Subunit: 504 residues, 4 copies
C-alpha cells in the first residue's frame, strides 16, 4: 500500500507515504462541498494558495450507493483526478450511517426502510433521524458500501496513492443517555464482552480515570452484565453505547483493511464543557474519556482524532495524544499557532482547519503552511524526541523555559500572537521557526557561560536544501544576546532561524 503508519526509534507513529515521512498540512472542505464535480472543481485553485498538501473531503453513502447494489463513482473519481492535477493528497471522509450523530447521509432506500434499518428511540419513545448502532442490518449495508468504495480506490489509486487515509463515519453518537430501541435495551442487560475486561485488566495502570474509577467503584469485577461491572448509572449506559459504536464501525473498517489497508481514524465531537454528561455531546463517539473502550473494541481503527474548535487547545491535544494514539486533528480553526503547537509539541500527523475553502485570503496561514512544508523533513526526523517542542503563547502566559542538552532556553513573547517550534539539531545547534517571540540561550551547567555563536535567517529550497537569506547580527540579535523570531516580511509570517551556540 502507498500509505502506512510506522513507529520510529522515539516511539512516535509516523505516516509514511510514497516511501517517505509525510505530515498532513491539511484542510477540510465544508460538508456539501464535494457533492457535485463542478462545485468541488471550483475550489482547487483557492486551496493551492493555502499551501495545503492534503485535502479532507467527504464521500456520501446517499450519493455513492443511490440504489442498493448500484454504485456511482463519479464523485470519488473526479476528486482523485482534481487532487492529482493540483498536487494534493486526500483523506476520504465516509459519511455513511452517521454524521454528527445523525443519519442524514444514509441512502433514500435506507431512510425509507425503518423496519430493516431501525432508528434510535428517545426516552419518550420517539424514533429519530438516526439509525440505531444496534441495527446489524445497517452495519452490513454500510460495511458493504464502504468496502466497495475502498475496492474502487485500490482499483484506480493503488499505484499513485493519492488517498492516504480514511475516516469511517463522522462524529458518531446520540444526544441521549442511551438508545431506547428494543435491541438497545436488551444489549444493556448482556454480559460485558471479555475483550473489554481483558483490555482493562492488562492496561489498568494506564486506563482513563473516567473508566477506572467507575470500574473500581463497583468492585473491578471481571465478569457480569454491564450494570454489575459498571453500576446502574449514566456511565455504564455510555460505556455499552460506546462499545456498540466502536464494534459496529470496526466491522466497517475491517472489511476495507482486508482488501486495502490505509491509516484509518474516527473523529469525535468533544466533551464541550467539563461537567457535560454523555448525550450533551454525542454519546458513543471516541471522546478521550472512552479512549480505552474504543481501543479494546476497534483494533481496525488506528487513530481516535479530536475535532477542536475550542480555545483550550493545549490541554485538549495533550488529552488525546497517548502512546497508543497519535495526534490527528481533522477539524480545527484556521489559526497558524495551533498547527505549530500540534506538529512541534506533539508530533501530530495532521492539522486541518474546517471549511478551509473559505479562508483563501488568509496570507499568514498560507505562509505558515509554506514554512511547515519546508520543515517536514526536520519535524519528521525528531518526532517523539525531547529535542523538539512547540511554541504558542496563551493569554496570561509571559514566558516558557526548557532544557535542551547543554542549554537552557528562555522563550519570551513579544505579542499575544506568538508561535513556532524549536528543534535542537546538534549539541550546539538549533532550528527555531515562528514569529513574535525571542529565545535566550544560557548554560545548564552554571560553571560555564553559554551564548549564541551565530544566527542565520533562511529557509529550505524545493530540493530540501537550506539557503540562508541573512546572517542576523547586530540590532537583529541584540549583538547575539537573543534570538529574535521576528518572522518573514512582505505583514509578518513565521520565519526559520538556524542558531549555533557555544560554551566557555
Amino acid at each position: 500500500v502507498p500509505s502506512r503508519l510506522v513507529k520510529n526509534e522515539h516511539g512516535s507513529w509516523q505516516l509514511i507515504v510514497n516511501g517517505k515521512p509525510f505530515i498532513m498540512l491539511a484542510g477540510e472542505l465544508h460538508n456539501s462541498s464535494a457533492s457535485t464535480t463542478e462545485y468541488l472543481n471550483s475550489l482547487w485553485t483557492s486551496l493551492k494558495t493555502l499551501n495545503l498538501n492534503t485535502v479532507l473531503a467527504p464521500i456520501a453513502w446517499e450519493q455513492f450507493e443511490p440504489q442498493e447494489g448500484i454504485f456511482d463513482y463519479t464523485l470519488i473519481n473526479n476528486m482523485i483526478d482534481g487532487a492529482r492535477k493540483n498536487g494534493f493528497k486526500l483523506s476520504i471522509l465516509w459519511f455513511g450511517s452517521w454524521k454528527n450523530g445523525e443519519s442524514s447521509y444514509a441512502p433514500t432506500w435506507v431512510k425509507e426502510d425503518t423496519k430493516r434499518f431501525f432508528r434510535v428511540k428517545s426516552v419518550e419513545g420517539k424514533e429519530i433521524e438516526t439509525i440505531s448502532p444496534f441495527c446489524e442490518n445497517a452495519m452490513k449495508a454500510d460495511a458493504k458500501a464502504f468496502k466497495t468504495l475502498v475496492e474502487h480506490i485500490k482499483k484506480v489509486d493503488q499505484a499513485t496513492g493519492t488517498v492516504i487515509a480514511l475516516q469511517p463515519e463522522n462524529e458518531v453518537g446520540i444526544f441521549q443517555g442511551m438508545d431506547y430501541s428494543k435491541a438497545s435495551l436488551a444489549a444493556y442487560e448482556q454480559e460485558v464482552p471479555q475483550a473489554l475486561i481483558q483490555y482493562m485488566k492488562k492496561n489498568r495502570k494506564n486506563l482513563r480515570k473516567e473508566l477506572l474509577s467507575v470500574w473500581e467503584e463497583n468492585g473491578a469485577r471481571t465478569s457480569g452484565a454491564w450494570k454489575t461491572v459498571f453500576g446502574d448509572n449514566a456511565w455504564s449506559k455510555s460505556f455499552y453505547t460506546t462499545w456498540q459504536y466502536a464494534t459496529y464501525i470496526d466491522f466497517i473498517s475491517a472489511g476495507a483493511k482486508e482488501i486495502y489497508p490505509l491509516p484509518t481514524f474516527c473523529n469525535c465531537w468533544l466533551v464541550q464543557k467539563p461537567d457535560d454528561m454523555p448525550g450533551v455531546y454525542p454519546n458513543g463517539g471516541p471522546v478521550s474519556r472512552v479512549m480505552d473502550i474504543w481501543k479494546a473494541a476497534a483494533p481496525h481503527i488506528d487513530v481516535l482524532a479530536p475535532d477542536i474548535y475550542l480555545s483550550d487547545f493545549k490541554n485538549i491535544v495533550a488529552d488525546y495524544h497517548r502512546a497508543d494514539n497519535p495526534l490527528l486533528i481533522p477539524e480545527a480553526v484556521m489559526k497558524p499557532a495551533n498547527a505549530f503547537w500540534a506538529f512541534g509539541e506533539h508530533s501530530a500527523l495532521c492539522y486541518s482547519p474546517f471549511g478551509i475553502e473559505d479562508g483563501a485570503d488568509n496570507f499568514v496561514f498560507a505562509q505558515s503552511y509554506k514554512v511547515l512544508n519546508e520543515l517536514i523533513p526536520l519535524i519528521s526526523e525528531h518526532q517523539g524526541s525531547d529535542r523538539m517542542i512547540g511554541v504558542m503563547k496563551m493569554p496570561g502566559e509571559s514566558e516558557r523555559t526548557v532544557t535542551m542538552g547543554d542549554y537552557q532556553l528562555c522563550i519570551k513573547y513579544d505579542a499575544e500572537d506568538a508561535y513556532g517550534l524549536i528543534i535542537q539539531t546538534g549539541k550546539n545547534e538549533f532550528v527555531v521557526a515562528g514569529i513574535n517571540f525571542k529565545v535566550y540561550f544560557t548554560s545548564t551547567d552554571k560553571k560555564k557561560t553559554g551564548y549564541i555563536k551565530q544566527v542565520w535567517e533562511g529557509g529550505y529550497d524545493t530540493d530540501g536544501e537550506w539557503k540562508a537569506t541573512r546572517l542576523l547580527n547586530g540590532d537583529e540579535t541584540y549583538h547575539n544576546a537573543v534570538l529574535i523570531a521576528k518572522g518573514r516580511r512582505t505583514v509578518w509570517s513565521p520565519g526559520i532561524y538556524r542558531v549555533t551556540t557555544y560554551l566557555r
Copy 2:
C-alpha cells in the same frame, strides 16, 4: 395576435406570448426617457444588466400627432427596434388625454383649443390644465390617435409581437369632488346607466363594500338619476365621475381592440391614506373602491393595475387581485421581495419598478429577476394553485405556517429582508426559492413523522433544464432538520433555488 390573456384550469389569468406562458419581469422608464431616440438608446445596456424581459415606455400624444392628422412614427419605431435588438418585450404606455390626472401630454393643437376641447373647472370656476372627461371631442381625437398608433404597431409588429400590452392613459382622475364644467353638471343629473344597475344586481356578492353600502343606504334602487340611486354626496359624485372616465377610455380601447386586440390595462394612483376622500387621489381613476364601476363600464379594458409606492404591499395587492382582475403592477419600488410576493402569492402578470434605468447598479435586484426568469415555466404552471405561495417578511411578523398536501411548512425568518416563493411540484417534492428564511417540514397527519429526505441547490439552465450545483446536507441543512434558503453567493447574497424531497415514516 401574438399576445393574449387566457384563463387556465385553476381560474388564473395568464399572458400567452408567442404561444408560451409569459410573466413580465418588467421595469418602467422615467416619464421623459423615451422622448428622443438618442436618450432611449442610451439606456438599453443598463436595462439588460437588470435582467428585464419587458420594458414599460410611453408614447406621448403631443409627439405622436404633433399636428392634427399628421403622425410621427419615429419614437415607436426606434423603441420597437431597440427592444428587439436588446431582447425585450414592450408594454406601451399611451400618454394621451391624461397622465397623473392632468393633460400636459395633449398636443399643442388640443391644448390651444379650449372651445373644442373644454377643460375641467374647479369649484371656484377656473379652467385647469386637465381636459374634461365629459368632452366628447377629446374622446374621439384621443381614440383616433390611439387607434392610429395601434394600427401602426400591427403593421410593424404583428408577426414578432415585441409589443405585448397597452396602457391607455396614465393615472386618470381629477383632484376635485367633481368637475364643474356645464357638461359635468348636466351629466350628474342624468339617469344612472342600466349597465351599472345590472352589473350591481348580478355581481352583488362580489361588489366592493364602498359601492354596495351607498347603493344599499339609498334603497338599492334599480332606476333613477345619480343622486336618487346613490344619494347627494361625495360618493355619488365619485361614481358618475368614475363612470365617465371608464366610458371615455373604453371607447379609446375598443377602437384599438377592433383592429389589433392586445392585453390592455389602466393604472391608478392609489387611495394614499384610508380616510382620503375622492379628489385627494385622482377622482375617476381605477382605485379598488370603484373597481366594479370600471368593470361595468369598460369591458375593453382587461385589467385595473395598481401603482404601488406604499409599504403596505401585501394588503394592497390582495385588495386589487380579484377573480375578475389579475394582479399587474406597472409601477412599484425596486424591491425584490415585492416581486417574489406578487408572482408567488398572487400569480401576477407583471412587476415593474418605476424609473428602472436608475437602478442598473442594483445587483441583488438583478439576480432576483435572474432567478425569477429561471422559474417562469414553473410559476406559470402553478398560477392560481394552492401549491404555490409567496414568502415575504414584514416588520413584526416572525413565522408563517401553511399546509401543502401531506406536509406542514413552517417558514421562519433569519433577517428582516427575507423573501422567496414555494412551489409543491410533487406529493413529496418542493421547489423553494429565496433568501434569509428557513422552512421546517412536518407531517399533516400527526400519526406520521414527516422529514426532509434530500436537498439540492441549483438553477435552470438556458435550455430550461434543472442543474444542481450542490447536494446540501450536514451543516447546510442542519442534518436535514431544516431547509436553509441562504441564497446564491457572489460576500453578497441573492435568492437561491432549492429542490427539497420529503418523506413520511
Copy 3:
C-alpha cells in the same frame, strides 16, 4: 484690426473678434506662470479642460526690455504660438511701471536709476519701491516699450488676431494719501485741468456722488487749484493723484492705439470695505468712486475693469457697469454663478478667475463654460436688452419675480448653489440655462391664464444648432406646472432648456 468694441442696437458694447460677437470665457494665469516658455507650455492642456476661449497672461517689462533699447520677443511669441495651437485668444497684461501699486516688474536699469526714474515718497520721506506717476521719464520709457510690444504683436498677429485686448499696467495706485515727492507736491498746487472741469459740467447729472458731492461742497467751481475746487482734504489728494495716473497711462495706451488699436482696459484693486479711505486701497487706480476722473483723463482706455474677490458680487458688478463702461472682469473667483450673473444680468465682455491653472479639476466650472459657449450667439444677440437676465441666489434670498412681455416669471431656488440665466427668444418662448432653480410662468394680464406649453432639454452643437436630448414632461416638469433647471447629469452642472408658453 481683428478685435474691436462696437455698440449694438440696444446700446450695449460688444467685442467683435474675427467679425463675430465674442465673449471672453476667460481665466488669468498666476503672476509668474508666463515668466518662461517651459512653465507656460506646461499649462495649456489644463486650461483646455476648463473650456476657456481666452487666456489672460502678462508680459513683464523687466523681461521684455532687459536692457534699454534691447527687446526680447521670446515670451510674447511663444505665448501667441501656444494660444493658437491650443484654441485660445489672448488678452495681454502689461506689467510695466506698476503692478499691485508697486514697480517690481520695472527693468533693472529702471529700478537702479532713481535720479532718472524717481520714486514715490512716503509722508515720512522714505523712497518706496514704486516709480512716481509724476515722473515723465518713466512715462516715456514705459510708453516706448509698450508701443514696441504692440508693434510686434501687429507684425506677428495682425491677420490672425490671437490677441484681442490689452491691459496696460495692473492695479495702479499708492498706499498713501498722496505722493510726497517734490513733483507730486508741486502738481497738487496746480490748476485743475480744464478737461476735468468740462467733463464734470457736461456730465454733472451722471457723476459719481463721491466726486459730485466734494465738487459741490466747495462751490462747484469751474476754475482754481485742486484745493480751491475740491477743498484741502483726502479727496482732493485722491483726485489729482487719480488724474495723474490716468494721464500717464493714457499716454502709454495712446502710443499703441496709434499703430494697432485694440480694446484696452485698466483694472482696479477695489475699495475693500465701505469706510476705506484712498490709500487703504491703491490711491490712483480706477475704482468706481473716481470713474469720472479716469473717463475724463484717459480716452485711450476703453474699459475700467474691477478685480472682484469679495462676496458682494452683485452690488459690485452693478457699481462698475455704467452706460460708458461695459462690465469686464479680468480677475475673480472660480465660481460659475458669478459668470452666469455677469454675462446674463450685465452683458459682460469678460469673466476670468485668477490663478485659473489651479482650477483644472473643477468639473462643474468647466461644464459651466461649455454651456456658456453654446450660449454665446444667443447671449450676444440679447446684450443690453430687457429680455435677458442672470440668475444667482445669494444667502438669505429665496425668490426673484420678473416680468417678460406677457409673462411673469417666478424664480425659486432649490439649493444655495442656484444660478443660470434666462433669455426670452419669442413672445411665447424662453431659453433657460442653469442649475438648482425652478421657474413658474403666469400671465401678466390677470384676465388670462399663462402656462408652460412644452419644455425641451438640450444644447447647441458645434455648428450652433439646437439639439434636444429630451422633451421634459410629467415628473420632469411637474406636469408642466414648472420648469425644473435640474442641470446636466454625470454630479450636476448647468443645463439648457427651451420652454414654450401659452395664454388661454
Copy 4:
C-alpha cells in the same frame, strides 16, 4: 588613491573623489543587510529612488575571515559590483573586534579561544562578550584581517575608486567604569604616555574642558601614572580606557594606510544625556569629551564621527565640528532638515540616515537629496566660508538674522518643518535652497536701502548648468518684498532652489 581629504583656502576639509570635490549624500544599511549577496542585491533599486550618491555598508570579520588565514571575498566583491552598477560610492564599515561595544562579529575561531583573545571582565569578575582592548593578540588579528580587506579593495578598485572611505570598528567601548581584566588593571598603573602629555601641552587652549579641568584639578602634571596625572576617579579610568581603544584601532588603521590610504573615520555612540558618566555610553568611544585623547593616540584615524539619533541636532553637530575634525555623520535619522543644516551650516562631508533601505517611499527625503546633489558644486566652493549658512527651525525659535556682506538676511519661518541653506554667490547675489521659510534682505549700512532686485526659481541640469523655471515676482515675491522658499511642488512639497539678485539705492 582616488579618495583624499584636502583642506581648501578657508581651512575646510573637503573630500576629493576622482579629482572632484565630493559630498556624501549617504545612507547606511541595517546591520545584517549586507550579509548575503542576494539580500543586498534586493536593495539597490530602492536605494536609487532616494538619490543617494554613497552607501554605507558593513563587512563582518566573522564572514570575511571564517577560518584563520582563509578569506572570503564574495561579499566585498558583490558589494563593489552592485555599487558600480547602481551609480553609488561605498564607505566600508569594518565590523571587526567591536560593534556597539561588543564582539559579536568576531570570527567563531576568535570567540572560542578566550585564552588567546581574552575578554573584558566586569567589576563582579564575569567575562563578557567583548574582547578586551588590552589584548594584543586581538589587535594583531584584527589588523591583519583589516589590511587583507583593504589590500583586496586596492586590487579590485584602485582605478575606479568605488570605495571612498573606511570605518574601522563601530561604536567601540565598554558599558563599565573600566575593564577588570588583569591586563587592564595593570595598564591603569602605568605612566601616562608622553604623546598625550605633549598633545595636552601643545593644544592646551583648544582642549576639551572635560579633559583640561581634570588635568588642572590634579596640578597639570607633565609626568606620572594615570591616577597621578588625572586623579583616582571615573575620568582617569575613562581616559586610559579611551587611550587604549584609540591606540588599538590606530594600529589597525596604520596597516591599511601603509598600503592604500583612504579617508578613515571612527564613529561613536553619543553621551545620551548630559549627566551620563562613562559606561552609560560605551567607555572608550570617540565622544567629543575625549576627542583630544583620540586625536593624540590615533593619527591614522582622520575623523571622529557622531551617530546622531537625538533631537538636539544643532548643538550636537557643533560640539563635534572642530578645526581638527570635519563633521561626518554616518548614522542619523531620515530628516531632510538635518542634511541641509549639516551641509550648509557645518560644511559636512557626510549625512547618512541609518536603516536607509526602510525609507524608500520617503518622497520628500528623495527630493531633498536631488536638490543637494544639484548644489554639491556650489556647496563645495563655499565650504568653510562665512558666505554659506544652513537653515533649520527648531521648536520655540521663530527667526534668524545674519549679516552677509552688504545685506542683512532676516529668515522667518512659515511652518515648523522649515529648512534649507543660503549661499552668497556674489556681492548682490544669493542662492537660497529649501522650504517653508521666507528671506527679507535689507542694507547693513542704514544710510542705504537694500532690496530684492529679481528672483528666479530653478535648478541645475545634468551638466551642472543653472536653468530657471520661473522668474518669481508679484504674489510669488510679495512684489519683491520677500523671498518665499515655497519649494518644488508635485500637492506634495520639497525643497526648491532660488536665485536672488539684490541692490542698494
